[PDB]
From a paper:
The proteasome comprises a 20S proteolytic core that in eukaryotes is formed from seven α and seven β subunits arranged in pseudo-seven-fold rings, two copies of which stack into a barrel shaped α7β7β7α7 assembly of about 750 kDa. The proteolytic active sites correspond to the amino-terminal (N-terminal) Thr residues of the mature β1, β2 and β5 subunits. The proteasome is a well-established target for cancer therapy due to its critical role in the highly regulated removal of cell cycle regulators and to its inhibition leading to apoptosis, primarily of fast proliferating cells.
We determined the structure of the human 20S proteasome core bound to the inhibitor adamantaneacetyl-(6-aminohexanoyl)3-(leucyl)3-vinylmethyl-sulfone (AdaAhx3L3VS)12 by cryo-EM and single-particle analysis. AdaAhx3L3VS is a highly potent proteasome inhibitor that irreversibly binds all the 20S core proteolytic active sites and can be modified to serve as a proteasome label and as a reporter of proteasome inhibition both in vitro and in vivo1216. The vinyl sulfone class of 20S core inhibitors act by covalently modifying the proteolytic active N-terminal Thr residues17. In the cryo-EM map of the 20S–AdaAhx3L3VS complex, densities are clearly recovered extending from the catalytically active residues of the β1, β2 and β5 subunits, with no analogous densities visible at the non-proteolytic subunits. The density extending from the N terminus of the β5 subunit can be used to unambiguously build the L3VS moiety of the inhibitor. Here the vinyl sulfone group and the three leucine side chains are clearly resolved and arranged on alternate sides of the backbone in an extended near planar conformation. The remaining Ada and linker components of the inhibitor are only partially resolved, most likely due to conformational variability, and were therefore not modelled. Better visibility of the inhibitor densities at the β5 active site suggests higher occupancy compared with the β1 and β2 subunits. On the other hand, in the closer to physiological conditions used for the cryo-EM sample preparation presented here, where the human 20S core was incubated in solution in the presence of AdaAhx3L3VS for 1 h at 37 °C, the inhibitor binds to all three of the active sites in a manner consistent with the results obtained from the in vitro activity studies using purified 20S core.
Author numbering:
A (entry chain M): 8 to 154, 163 to 205
B (entry chain B): 5 to 197, 206 to 226
C (entry chain G): 8 to 50, 66 to 201, 208 to 237
D (entry chain E): 13 to 124, 134 to 236
E (entry chain N): 4 to 77, 84 to 175, 183 to 200
F (entry chain F): 6 to 50, 62 to 175, 178 to 197, 209 to 224
G (entry chain D): 5 to 54, 63 to 137, 140 to 176, 184 to 235
H (entry chain C): 2 to 57, 64 to 244
Amino acid sequence: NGGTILAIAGEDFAIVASDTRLSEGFSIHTRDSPKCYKLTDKTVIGCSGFHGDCLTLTKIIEARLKMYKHSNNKAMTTGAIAAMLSTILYSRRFFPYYVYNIIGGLDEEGKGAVYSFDPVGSYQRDSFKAGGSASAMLQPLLDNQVGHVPLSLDRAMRLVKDVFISAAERDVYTGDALRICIVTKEGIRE
Amino acid sequence: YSFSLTTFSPSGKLVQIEYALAAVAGGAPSVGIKAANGVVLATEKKQKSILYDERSVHKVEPITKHIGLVYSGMGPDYRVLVHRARKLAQQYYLVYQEPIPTAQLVQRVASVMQEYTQSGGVRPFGVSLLICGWNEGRPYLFQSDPSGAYFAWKATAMGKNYVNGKTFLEKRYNEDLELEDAIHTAILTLKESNIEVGICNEAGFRRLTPTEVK
Amino acid sequence: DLSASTFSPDGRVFQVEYAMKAVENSSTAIGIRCKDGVVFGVELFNVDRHVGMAVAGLLADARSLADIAREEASNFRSNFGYNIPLKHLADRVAMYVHAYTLYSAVRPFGCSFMLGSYSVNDGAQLYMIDPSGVSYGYWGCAIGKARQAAKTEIEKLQMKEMTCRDIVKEVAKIIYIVHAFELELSWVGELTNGRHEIVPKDIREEAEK
Amino acid sequence: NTFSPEGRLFQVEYAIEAIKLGSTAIGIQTSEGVCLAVEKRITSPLMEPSSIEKIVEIDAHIGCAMSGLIADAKTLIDKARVETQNHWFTYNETMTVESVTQAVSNLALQFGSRPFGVALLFGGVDEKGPQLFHMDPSGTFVQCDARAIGSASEGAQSSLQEVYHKSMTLKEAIKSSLIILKQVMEEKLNATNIELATVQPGQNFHMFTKEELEE
Amino acid sequence: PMVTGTSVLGVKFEGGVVIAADMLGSYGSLARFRNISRIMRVNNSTMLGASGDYADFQYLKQVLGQMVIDEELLSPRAIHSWLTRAMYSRRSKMNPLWNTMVIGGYADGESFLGYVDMLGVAYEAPSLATGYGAYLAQPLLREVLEKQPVLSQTEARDLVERCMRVSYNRFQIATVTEKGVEIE
Amino acid sequence: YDNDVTVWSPQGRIHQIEYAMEAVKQGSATVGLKSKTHAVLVALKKILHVDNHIGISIAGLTADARLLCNFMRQECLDSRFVFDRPLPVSRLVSLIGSKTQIPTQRYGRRPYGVGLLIAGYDDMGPHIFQTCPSANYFDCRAMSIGARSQSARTYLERHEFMECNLNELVKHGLRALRENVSIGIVGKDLEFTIY
Amino acid sequence: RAITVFSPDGHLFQVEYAQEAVKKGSTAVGVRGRDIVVLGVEKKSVAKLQCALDDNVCMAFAGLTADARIVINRARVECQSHRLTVEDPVTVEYITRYIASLKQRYTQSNGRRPFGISALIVGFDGTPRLYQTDPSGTYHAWKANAIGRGAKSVREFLEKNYDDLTIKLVIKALLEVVQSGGKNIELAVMRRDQSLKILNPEEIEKYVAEIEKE
Amino acid sequence: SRRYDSRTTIFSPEGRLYQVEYAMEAIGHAGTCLGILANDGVLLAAERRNIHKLLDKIYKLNEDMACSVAGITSDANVLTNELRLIAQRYLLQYQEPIPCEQLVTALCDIKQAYTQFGGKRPFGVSLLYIGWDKHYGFQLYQSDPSGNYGGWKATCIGNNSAAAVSMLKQDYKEGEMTLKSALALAIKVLNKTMDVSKLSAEKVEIATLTRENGKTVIRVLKQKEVEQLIKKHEEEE
Amino acid sequence: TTTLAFKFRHGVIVAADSRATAGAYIASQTVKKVIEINPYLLGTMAGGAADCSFWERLLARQCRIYELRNKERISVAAASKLLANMVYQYKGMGLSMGTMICGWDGPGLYYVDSEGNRISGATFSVGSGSVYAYGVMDRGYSYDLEVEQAYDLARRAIYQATYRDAYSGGAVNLYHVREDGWIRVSSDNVAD
Amino acid sequence: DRHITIFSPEGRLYQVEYAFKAINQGGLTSVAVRGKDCAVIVTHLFKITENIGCVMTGMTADSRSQVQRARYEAANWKYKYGYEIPVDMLCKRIADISQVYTQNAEMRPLGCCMILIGIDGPQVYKCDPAGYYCGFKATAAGVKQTESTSFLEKKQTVETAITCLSTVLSIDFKPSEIEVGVVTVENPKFRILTI
């Protein structure tokens, strides 16, 4: 179990795309699952690693961000999630959540956000990251054509798109339908 | 509660304990004598309605292989106090493996009765009880009272009209007397103020056998 | 006398009685044991699917006893399987009601409530629980404000062979005579199959009529 | 614990009476900056003139003046610092004054043993800019513009009522506290008879040196 | 894990959800309980079947009945949601349940068919088949889906009636119907 | 002498609960009415976001209102997490009665003297629920709590509010409040919000 | 039970009573001598049949000494615990803060009463620091302070007058105002890094006799 | 419930705790006792509560330390028990016999806790400690029935403590006593305190703490010796 | 995961390579190891990546609670000591790191291992590459060192470490804690 | 004083005797007779164990707590030992826990006399809220308890009990009014006689 996540934000878009399928071992069970659950018009979170954990973790994230939204009556910052989620991963670390989560909330400055995680908490603002099973396949290539671009969005959509065509025919845990969730100032753009 | 119901009077007297001594003043008379064959303890109990039983709840309850108790005061309180006294004795036997010295069981039980004169939400034990025992070469006759103060005695009395009963015990008796002969002073001091009796000697603790009480 | 642990010299604890007075104020509930079923009426709680409850006395406290009774029915269903009998349920909830009377700190309950249950073996059972924790079976019960005042008309009824079907109207009728009256009625009898349930709205409207 | 027949609790209203034997404190809010101010509350001359303190930091952005029972204040103050750093540890943003005050209000009447007598004046310049939350010992926080807390404070309240200004300038708002503290005090105010602390929109909270206070 | 039944299927019919399952509760190679009915009927319609250690089914049958019985006197999606909470909580202590259950319930024109893995993995899927059909029944379910993207009352019905022939043939055919809660 | 929470009056009921009712009266008024489209809190500035579709209006002492409210938020998340749906309002109000219950039944523990109006949007059509200082709560077509509510109630026997929609409700909610206006609206179209 | 519930006055009962309890204590004079600290106490009530928390911090409590040691023990556990957590020793201020927090705690508590002491916590940092701590939990720095019976009159005696000379102040306050006692007085200068050090009575005669000359 | 509680930890408006004052007065009901230090040993005379014929206070805290218990008997036993425990726990881990001054501070911490909190009655029993701690030699301490302790060269406690201790103020010369002078003064003051001119053997019992040949030993006097001191008293009269 | 530190008469320099890895895959080369606690004293990160962040967040928190309450700076001795205590409790839990406290006090450099090895030297290199970093370090190190010569020394010693250690790649990240306090003296590349 | 179990200046617990007066005001009048071969009880009949029964007499609510405690202990006996608890042992243990009410001032005496009957030959134990228990030969407890005791002292077993209640309450009964329980030598099974 696993599966691939990818995210890039330069200019306003935080393109969080991921494959739908989950495999318990090899027995692809539903081909319709999203990994990139939306949380807020801006927050979108990919989660790869272990679905059973991903579910539980995202419900805990949603509950906690709503608690914040009551406690401060101020929207949950993307930067607050980057510092918050790492502590959530540490809270259950001696028995750990086997989950690699990419955060995509829209900033206060109207820019993209990507925050790489590992199972024990390593938040990283970065221009791109792919996590999951095919991440080793995608990082050098995706880094090469993205990392003097003004973050061109149309070519960037094609650049996000094509690498999952390539990962899907190469790694056996990326495939089926691709779901993309751009995060722009107009909102989440599924 | 958590707050003790024992507090000093303006000159430093434990009022509730003094009232517990008043509860000792009630209850049927008890008597006990250290003779030199063995101690005897005896107490008035009464038919009262003529529908009672006499072997149901003896005031004379053996505690340990050669200790016994006789109480004056409230009967209900005795039933539980005896239980803890037996607890201390059996607990002592599994740790130390000899039936506990008379003086020690009296001391430990005295500490139990002291705890409630300092412990929250509880009144002091009304019961005062003779605790008569014989170890080694000596018959032991003890008096524990409501404050947890205890004294060894050569002869002593409790309950109603102990005040005269002790007086008879110091003039009608002294020194030593063969055990039934020191029971003579029991049966005749008790007379000043049905009856249960129990004796100690060195023959395992014993209830003076009913045909021979007569 | 004012604290629950203390006894007044004469022979009672007056606190328990002051707590009893609370249900002597609130308006009449009236359940009626019947040839089948107990039609609760109160001018209702699904204690269990099996068991209905009709509270009287201050409502705030009454709900907590309802919830405890729901808990009690569930623990019995889990540990034993089989749906709880009312003769045991009354005694359990009544025991919990009784505990308060015994200690100074918690106050006695204000409520008194008639739980009832139709079941196959027992048939209809209509037990009322006092805030003292004195529960008895009944043939009829009526507690509240019009306490003996309702009792004279349930005495006028002779359910022993009245059907539940007359009684669904009669409870509301007794309510109208002792009594504007908001009406509530319940049916628990074998037509309802022991499903605690409110009277069907047309019959309930007819009953007020 | 006993709600009086007239509604409101007893110990709280007695705690409110405890504030009256507490230091006067103006809680100026200029829209530029924050200017918490408090009478030194010194009475004894060999009691130190620079070791007595009335106003404490909580974060680098929130100051906290106190009044009423001075000893009691420090428990709620220390716990406020623990709360703010806990917020920093979990979310990396600093805890805004509305929630810093709220967290302290939550602890205010938790006696199931006795209520605190303290009035507090958090002042913290947070992204909204200046904010000044008064905190009653009734477990009630309220946003303010100018509230002066303590004993001669009722006269400081009404004085503030004429002079309160739309907007306000930082230095001018400071001068308001410097003048009003002479009125509320019995003695003629001296820089060793006040401990002022101010937070300009850009700066981190500063205890004000005395020389500046004479002017 | 102790004695275990397997072979639970589920799949929707438009306005209904067939769920068939054989009735074996084998323990080892021996088929010790060739009588267990694994299809609990939860609510006037919705229902769970279970394929995994049967003790866990008994526990969750009585516990899910607790949640429903409570709430009734106070939806399939909700039952699956909680069921994921239950399967997950037992995994967290590493004292799982070995049960793997399909929850088919017609809710408001929608045939929810959750699947809750023992180790708490969870998703809805239209044509679910739990173990031994999670490699065998599953292509037979899909092959119909590869061709026609939806299944009718009659399609999923016959699909399961044949697929179960593809354990022993003693299976009960529970069928949620617009009403809900049938068993054959 | 019934100055303890446990004690019952020879005359009648526990006096602390009755004194908790008067604790409500020093807090400012708040009015709750509703239509099938939107629930309407109006509060004479007190409205709080309990949930994404539920909001309370405090009256009385603020302290108990926050204590009950801090609980309300956690309880709303309980149903939203465990079962994956919005908490139905009526159940949460039933939890308020349960949490307010403990002081009345016990010693050394004072009652939650806040009176609350829990307006919420609901799947049975929006509901508002006053919760009194005793556990007891009331389903009601319309209600008012806080200072001088009796004038506000008097207006409502003649009142139309289940028909006319949210703009006109609020226009009349302000008229009721006259008998400094925070407004709390939730409906099928929109999440609870503090106008 | 809450003990220190607020009065209808706004005062706290137990706390104000504790303020009058330290007034019965003896006249624990202190002053923060510019060179070094000096502190002292008086009225030992010699029948003739008859503190330091660190090598920096020291204490000169007034009040009822029965409580005062009990406060200082916990204060000493706090000093050593701090030396193990921060590498350096505890500062006088941190001690004063803890003792003040500790005393505060018992007012807001079940069943407890404020510690009746008002400690003159004193100590080098190498600059002298001379705190008062009072039962309320208020702690104030001072440069002179004296708490005790008749100590208030001594503070005023200091106010109008404020190694040999700081000792002259500490003596003078007592040998002019309080009863003349060549043994009752027990002043102890603390040198900069030498631990608080008492003198023999004959060494105190540097001013105990020179005041007789003055 | 707590409406009954009389507090018994309260702080009074006169500024002196109630139970502490009452504890002081309980001891006046307690019978006479006195301990007298010397430069070689420490005496402890005590008077057996009544002479009563048919009945057939000092205890062994250690073999190098011992206590006299004055105020009451039932409480005293618990005090002695706790003293033996503290001393033998200290001997357990530090592996040296407890220094006596410490043992007193420990029990007085336990006593003080009863006044300070918990709403429980305090132990009303003044104690003496005779002992010979390693670091100071012979020493005697008195424990007020609230925490205090005072190293005393001679002291009395019990009935007429005031007259007896005041009698020793001038009648105990400082730093001159051979143990012989300790016996003489002991017998004097205990003689003067009772209305009985001289005292009987069923009245005094004297635990002398003597450094016995490099192993300190406590010994209650053997009654034949008790009567030589009393027989000397009859001629001291 | 190399993090050299050394102190000399004009500062304490703390250089760190930016590579982080899981397996033989390299997730990023962007991390700045020298996690901040204080304007004038700073952390390090060696050993597992998450551990150092978390522990030094707790450290930064506790140093902040201390600086507010005590109303003075926390010292390098005290900072390392609270840190050493806090990491000890999790000894045997595998929370392994090689954090270092650095900062001007004179200068204070205290290496602080995860098993509680709070040792005060002057010259350290911590991590996988440390054995490489050490050998270069000693050869130029003298207390008689200019701020520039020391900059070069920190850069050479990191450069020679990353050259051999497979799990250490990324750019050198000097921080110089001089008298006043730290500055990001260089973040400069290794691929020069 | 007379409110918290403590001793009066006469060495007398007030609350205990108040509990006896509460037993008398329970209004019931139980009698039991110990025949040689049978152990009649008459009055609230209970079956504490299949071989043991008892009749509580006093406060109605109070009876049930000690009934359940009696069943708890009786069952726990067999659980640790494995034979019927003797009637003496059961009465002893219930008396020992009724003393706890008396020793503790927190909680109050439960006013119910407990007339146990059962064969260990036949036993007729009494228990008081005092914590005092004793075997009688022909007990009675209740309202006209003293008036019955005379008639018992003057003294086919069933007749003794029934004529005792008839003569002493001075009323001719209906069979429903007199509940009667017998434990015959051959019938150690507690059984209501069913005149």
